[PDB]
Design a protein around this nucleic acid. Structure first.
Length: 77
DNA sequence: CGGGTTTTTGTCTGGCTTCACACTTGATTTGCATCACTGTGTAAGACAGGCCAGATCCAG
């Protein structure tokens, strides 16, 4: 298959594609279930007045990552 | 320099396939250009200069 077909099929495996909900709502955690690669700094202030920032980071959301991991192991279970 | 004897083929002949060929338009799928960067360049040798040490020389 050409590259666009592969890229399109990739979206099924990445986190933020399957619906779910926690029965007790998670405190201080959003309920939206389509986030992908959240920024690592998490909205950290990067102006000139605050503490200087000299790092970069990328990461998924924890619950979405667990959901994707569990869905990747459906046939096994 | 050209006579015999099979190969190598396009047809004649007209009549049966299986694919070929006008139009759309709205998607859907491929194909290709573009952009900010990457690695491989990766240990020793030649030469001048300050510094004492000790040899080189001076004079009572």
């Amino acid at each position: 298959q050409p590259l666009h077909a592969l890229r399109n099929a990739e979206k099924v495996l990445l986190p933020g594609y399957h619906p779910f909900e926690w029965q007790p709502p998670l405190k201080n955690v959003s309920s939206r279930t389509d986030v992908g690669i959240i920024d690592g700094l998490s909205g950290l202030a990067s102006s000139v007045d605050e503490y200087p920032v000299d790092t970069i980071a990328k990461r998924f959301r924890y619950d979405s990552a667990l959901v994707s991991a569990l869905m990747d192991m459906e046939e096994d279970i």
